[PDB]
């Protein structure tokens with residue numbers, strides 16, 4: 001049993017590579033998709049009242 | 063150059079949405095004194111520009127650390143986190159990220175014997191953040207290896223199918239230990255990211271460039 | 280004998296004609312990067328304009344804003360070309376982003392080129408087709424260029440004015456230098472007085488002239504005070520400055 | 525023309541059949557939030573689909 | 576004809592339908608289903624360690640014995656604590 | 672691919688009065704969204720076979736290195752102790768409740784879409 | 796081998812700090828039970844504090860164990 005590895009810098013660079021890939025994949029592939037779903041639902045839920053009142057005012061059918 | 067199609071409402075999308083909203087909620091934005099409207103909206107957008115992305119960073123660290131921590135519990139696999147350089151490199155990385163943010167706020171200027179004592183107390187966060195997670199992963203694997211040898215010894219020196227109650231008891235103890243290792247894997251990933259959020263939120267504070275001139279009524 | 284050879288190779292192959300002849304494949308790309316590097320010669324852009332002129336109507340939005348910025352830097356105005364660029368912008372105005380439209384409107388404001396349909400499509404694209412915080416990321420000189428463009432052409436669009444008034448604040452005006460901030464404040468206040476539109480964010484313009492009135496002359500201060508009294512009457516109160524606290 | 529005009533509306537959104545015509549003006553109000561809630565949840569739940 | 580389709584359907588039928596808590600009628604011996612899951616977990620561990628030890632044996636264990644042998648190797652080449660001595664004793668035991 | 676409502680309008684205006692009630696179902700089925708039917712079941716993907724063969728090669732390589740190791744038998748028994756928990760998690764975890772809990776984690780799936788109402792966008 | 800003998804003695808004397816950290820951790824978890832009994836409406840908040848508290852408390856154990864490793868396998 002050894003505490004230290006063969007190279008501390010190699011393991012540190014492995015951690016940096018893995019975490020930087022998780023950062024790029026999060027910011028680039030995951031967070032656009034997440035925010036497309038979330039901001040569609042949130043924009044509709046935040047604008048339902050104003051949207052329906054504006055469309056009710058525009059609608060000449062009544 | 064063509065991206066893949068995603069089903070809306072997938073379980074990984076929902077899980078990562080909850081995780082991101084959690085680590086984003088750890089450092090909430092401050093309410094301004096003025097009411098938020100179109101006069102205050104560039105001040106709010108610049109406040110969001112000056113705030114560091116601790117939600118993205120904490121989600122990054124949570125996902126990579128829980129992935130390595132759970133890799134330690136798959137068969138034929140050890141955690142990368144149980145290595146010293148990996149886990150303590152992540153810890154020194156979070157401490158240096160918080161320090162680089164706090165230095166850049168102070169104009170890239172480095173910071174009455176209270177100042178070296180607080181310097182050592184702050185600098186020990188670099189040791190503690192990585193050594194905690196690395197020590198927990200190393201201790202759990204080491205404890206399992208020592209415990210497994212004792213359990214193996216019981217049926218090696220008492221017959222394969224000749225000592226049922228003591229072997230059953232020690233395998234119950236080993237199985238409860240592996241369940242504890244699952245709990246410790248999840249907990250140490252969450253602990254690393256919570257302490258990451260508090261260490262960077264010490265320096266996340268910035269000036270709100272609000273309105274300098276207004277119509278009073 | 281190599282020096283006579285390199286003198287023969289240096290005056291016949293690496294010339295401006297082969298430079299503008301290799302720049303025919305992707306001409307908004309090449310005109311953009313050659314104009315940024317500093318190559319602003321007139322005859323090359325005369326060649327470049329008839330290079331793009333067929334294929335303008337099917338260009339991308341990034342290539343349209345690249346070509347328009349390049350011809351802004353070369354200062355060469357081709358009426359049929361900018362009619363083609365204006366028809367491209369008016370054709371697929373929903374695809375254009377606000378920063379691209381601000382660069383395009385800056386080029387169309389350097390010359391006096393405008394249609395009613397182009398102005399309505401740019402205002403519709405900035406207001407409705409784009410994010411409402413896109414003027415916040417703009418920089419107040421670009422928005423003041425657009426405001427003076429719409430004021431010069433007399434096109435009144437109150438929704439576009441309410442959109443690009445959002446970009447004027449302490450932040451975006453504080454990003455500018457002092458002479459550029461004075462020019463931007465004068466342009467924005469003149470356009471807002473032309474339209475008769477005084478939003479709640481005009482005071483961040485007016486304050487940017489009144490926190491530092493040392494750079495402003497007496498007639499410019501009279502103009503700023505005229506817009507200040509007009510905005511006081513429109514917004515419904517009196518204009519104070521806020522101190523540090 | 526009236527059958528065609530109602531056919532387009534009942535093809536795009538067939539949930540308009542659950543409001544009788546003679547009661548439609550009895551639902552409205554000056555603000556949209558003041559429209560009578562007798563049919564609103566029924567309109568939304570029928571518009572969500574047959575499943 | 577396909578292999579992975581039958582493998583998926585067969586593992587589905589084994590995972591969901593095949594239940595030895597009701598097929599063997601273990602509800603009389605055991606209290607609940609979760610107790611059966613815990614005992615099947617620990618029984619899986621016991622059978623696995625016995626198959627590994629039973630698989631390849633007789634060998635000098637790298638794990639610490641508590642001073643107990645397998646009752647057939649008092650001091651041959653399996654209970655030796657020194658490893659080089661156990662190696663040469665294994666060699667003169669393998670020559671036989 | 673044009674507007675489907677514009678196709679509904681053109682197809683309804685193009686019919687005669689005698690043909691309208693007969694053709695309404697076909698005008699409904701023409702401007703209805705494409706839900707693509709299930710294709711023929713094929714082999715596994717290139718990436719799926721790469722993933723399975725790479726996982727098997729990693730498992731074999733790690734089991735080989737665990738065999739070569741000094742405390743080899745406790746390595747191979749740690750694999751049993753971990754596979755036991757992967758077995759017991761398939762029996763313990765309430766996957767329907769876990770699915771709906773994760774659905775509650777995201778606000779996009781926690782609630783229904785509250786958006787356009789019928790009375791606002793009606794056209795009499 | 797008096798150095799290795801003192802290594803075993805020093806590691807066995809080194810792990811005494813796990814007693815104090817276990818007593819403190821039990822005090823903190825007993826107070827978590829108490830605080831959930833006082834005000835269960837915020838109980839899922841309190842457990843979070845407990846985990847965070849356990850976090851920092853656990854670190855004092857690991858700086859013990861690290862010294863043990865620095866005694867044993869350095």
Ligand SMILES: [Zn+2]
Pocket residue numbers: 140203207746749
């Ligand atoms: Zn191991």
